[PDB]
DNA sequence: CTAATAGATTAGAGCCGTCA
RNA sequence: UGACGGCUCUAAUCUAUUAGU
């Protein structure tokens, strides 16, 4: 009679030559393999975006609790799990356009609006990277 | 529609990582009920949000979250998927090489191959005999340069079966007597099945062999550790067919099962299809946004 | 044993409700007494975690002691705890994470993993058991006009190069036109069904693949013909018609302690299915289930998007047990016999399809009584 | 060639081409993150 | 040398929810 | 475009026959 053969779950490798199946508890126990510790970042957007990003960035240091523990492993903290520093006091911000001449009066050919948005963002990022001195690693873009 | 695609595609020429975050994720407080029905909610899931973000950013910094170590040394791996561009003459020609795994003594390689080779046909897919030789030769010198010797065994994934001529050409570009095999992996085929007793679906990891060639696998059950289902309703399995070559079914099946947890973009315990097919699928639309680029990089940090 | 004979330090934790617990206060008094006994270095090292616990409102007996802070970041608390520990000249031991992994897996291993018990599963397919030994083709190049198509006919009949692919006798078309019998059946053509299903048949004008296509088309149209007179009607679909039934049409909207037509958002919902034949592993019938809405059973919502939202809302709380039981109940109701379903494909010929689905037995399982 | 007999300018261009190509391949191919490069010269 | 039927075999492209 | 799954709607082309070269 036709029957079902079963296949077991494999294992993944972690730091210190340890093993586990889920990766979350392994990271909470052993951490990553290679150690890199620079998250000097960059950001563009509006000032309310600045304050909200600062609040969310310095909020993650404290542990945050899921509603149900048994299905989601706990998150103690970024420095608690990774051993890498990431704070809200070393950002190099570049200001965004605020006038936004595009309004409800201009809605025909939204492709042109998208082109203008992307051109503005890309030129700002490229100019900031090319001209300034500080060494940035990642660029976060926020927009409603 | 193409905002992110266009932005990343044109910024790709300057070698700069980036990360796009919608404000609603950050500001999920004040976007509450307009007239009594809340717009938005992450209360129940809030902690997991952090698990979704941090490690991803870590990868963009240059960190390796976790690596798989269940691979036989001295073997190959590769994947492929097509794409429709329909630019001028409704061309169907966009093939994006997915990845390749290598053991350079102690490390693992995850850079893959690139180059959207073209094809005059518009609806038949497949591949003209000229492109395939270069396509396989590229992985060949990559293996030579990252191995300081020649590769031993080679595996290939796909999405659709293919005709005799191009596989014959693939065998023509085979150095020495190495074994080559390609496996076709579909996504949806109806084999709905139920559980006789209880109120829970099938338990993850089962199989149902119909022949020495074909096979099946289930991926959305519920792990006992998680104790909860990975899909809201009853699942749908993946149908596996071996096209050519002499490959044992069980080893290839366990290998393709073992490559469904390397989803660096997230941290969910289980994922439906292997990383390769979806990974090439998500790199294709980056390069189809605008085609003026020449020799794009082969590091997936900038793509993802 | 351990508090007196084999303890060196102490790690009291000052939570928000730690003062309430009587057991922790009792063991705290024990620790105070053992400290009053020893008087060597120090024993008690408090810890603080909560933000609500103000630094002055801490437990009354412990106000005399300070505390390393953990309210900001756990990493620095672990760091200064460990370097204070190693400054206190506590005896060491080489690190070994393998023991930690073993302890973690052992303390959390029960009510998980897999169990060697056997269980059973139900499939979605029904295998055929009856079929006439041979089918018949007969074309005169004059029997029928060559312009109208075969959707007009309601009986097995499809065009072909020279072999008109019909199932019933070629003289069973009197109902609207005479002279059918005048077309002599001696010059007819027969092909064995058993052999072509076995696949050994092969000719220069007929191969296996297209004749298999022919027979599956005939069985599909026969399934439609046998379905149409079940008194369950159909709604237009991107795929074939979606077949379903109304409340009240069955006795008091109930059939063997199962309810299929219900109410949601002031709309009445029913449980329909669709089907189609597949043959390669075995001759079986794919059946899939869907949920249909209506305002009063006479009309249905026109917008597909709000229908989509409504069907998701309705199906959010339906699970495996209900799915399986409802499918089995509906297919049993569909069964026109107590044993199988007949398919009157011919004038008198029929094909019997089992109403009982397939089975599977598996040798591996989990901890079933998970309750939630 | 070891001796600067054929063309010193050609040898310098060849050496700089080799170094530049190696550096560019390293930048565009690998996965790590680096900031500076300390080139030694024989 | 163009067009109606018909199966088997393919890709976009949106909406709901996220565990009773 | 924080990611995953489940459904629904749309498109071609290949493979018999047939009518107009
Ligand atoms: Mg991303």
Automatic annotation (TrEMBL), chain A:
The source's domain of life comes to Bacteria
Which region is the signal sequence?
none
Task: Write down what this protein is called.
Answer: Piwi domain-containing protein
From TrEMBL, chain C:
Q: Does the keyword GTP-binding apply?
A: no
Leader sequence residues: none
Q: Boundaries of each TIR domain copy?
A: 1-82
The molecule here is called: TIR domain-containing protein
Q: Name one GO molecular function term.
A: metal ion binding
Determine the domain of life of the protein's source.
Bacteria
Tell me the part of the parent protein that is shown: 51 to 422 of 450
GO biological-process terms attached to the record:
signal transduction
Tell me which UniProt keywords the record has, alphabetically.
Answer: Metal-binding
Q: Where are the transmembrane segments?
A: none
